[PDB]
């Protein structure tokens, strides 16, 4: 049993086309969602800042985005993670606010019945 | 202290021919009552208060809402001419 990698260039191209196929479907919006900034959970890496999964409910509440609309504008929600320190809260609230400063949200049509 | 005693009901027990040096039956238990009378140790007294402390919703003091949803749906069908009215059914 030997696993060959002759399809390594083919997989590189296939993933690139998936990125372009996705961008064709969603024309003006980014192909990835915004990820939070977290700290790896060990003494070896806790000084590094890496990308998280989603923003905590306390982060979203502070930034002014409700958890029901956060997913609609591309902000992932992590119900599992929590803010044990005020630094993680401030690092990711600013990340959300900067995200909302650069965001153009196109309006949607709404059904308005003629009567009351 | 526990005195390191030994109860008379422990699982372990004491005692070619094994005589060199020194240091089954179907026995019942007792006449036991297998069908004891019902013992009301909890409902012998009446609980005077309702079990639930949840507040009473306003839906129980107002006309039914899902009936109103049906009434508006039936009225719409009458306006759209989908449901024959009682007078129309009677005259037909």
């Amino acid at each position: 049993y030997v696993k060959t990698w002759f399809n390594q260039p083919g997989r590189k191209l296939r993933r690139r086309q998936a990125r372009q196929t996705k961008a064709a479907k969603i024309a003006p919006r980014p192909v990835e969602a915004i990820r939070p900034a977290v700290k790896p959970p060990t003494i070896r890496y806790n000084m590094k800042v890496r990308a998280g999964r989603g923003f905590t409910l306390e982060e979203l509440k502070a930034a002014g985005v409700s958890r029901r609309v956060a997913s609609t504008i591309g902000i992932p929600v992590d119900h599992r993670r929590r803010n044990r320190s005020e630094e993680s809260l401030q690092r990711n609230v600013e990340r959300i606010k900067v995200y909302l400063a650069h965001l153009i949200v196109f309006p949607r049509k709404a059904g308005q019945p003629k009567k009351g | 202290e526990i005195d390191a005693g030994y109860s008379s009901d422990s699982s372990t027990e004491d005692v070619n021919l094994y005589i060199n040096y020194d240091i089954q039956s179907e026995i019942p238990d007792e006449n036991f009552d297998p069908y004891p009378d019902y013992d009301d140790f909890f409902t012998n007294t009446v609980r005077e208060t309702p079990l639930s402390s949840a507040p009473e919703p306003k839906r129980r003091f107002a006309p039914s809402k899902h009936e109103q949803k049906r009434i508006l749906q039936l009225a719409y069908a009458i306006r759209k001419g989908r449901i024959l009215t009682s007078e129309q059914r009677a005259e037909r």
Partner: protein, 164 residues
């Protein structure tokens, strides 16, 4: 085998006379039929469509979860339990819960009669919570009869292991 007291209590049911009086009050409080409800709703629909305040309906209460809820809230005045519920565990706790809440209760014969009152094929339990002011005396008389014929009667065999 020997029937436990919780299951043996369902062999002693309400007698002929008191059960007849029970269903006579119940038949005055039957729920609105699917047909009758439809006529009343379209009548309001015609009023709404042309141009347009009622009273709270009075009827018997049915459904196991609903009735057990009413007993726990002490809203029920009389609970009638079918004596032949096929899995008996659905009602085996009901007489004791009615005892804990001090709700008058009886075990009437068969579930077909209970279901007929509510326009269904089968009702495991019925409960009466509210009656009109003219039926207060009739309900009070039945509660006394149920107590005298079902609670005052027996009350000693329901603690005994029946069967065998």
């Amino acid at each position: 085998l020997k029937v436990p007291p919780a299951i043996a209590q369902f062999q002693k049911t309400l007698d002929k006379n008191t059960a007849t009086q029970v269903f006579k009050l119940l038949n005055k409080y039957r729920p609105e039929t699917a047909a009758e409800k439809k006529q009343r709703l379209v009548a309001e629909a015609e009023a709404v469509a042309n141009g347009k305040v009622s009273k709270k309906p009075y009827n018997v209460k049915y459904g196991l979860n609903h009735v057990v809820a009413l007993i726990e809230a002490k809203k029920a005045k009389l609970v009638l339990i079918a004596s032949d519920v096929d899995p008996i565990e659905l009602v085996v706790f009901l007489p004791a819960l009615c005892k804990k809440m001090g709700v008058p209760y009886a075990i009437v014969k068969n579930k077909a009669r209970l279901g007929t009152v509510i326009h269904q094929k089968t009702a495991a339990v019925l409960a009466v919570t509210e009656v009109r002011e003219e039926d207060k005396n009739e309900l009070a008389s039945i509660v006394s009869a149920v107590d005298a014929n079902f609670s005052a009667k027996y009350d000693e065999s329901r603690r005994k292991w029946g069967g065998g």
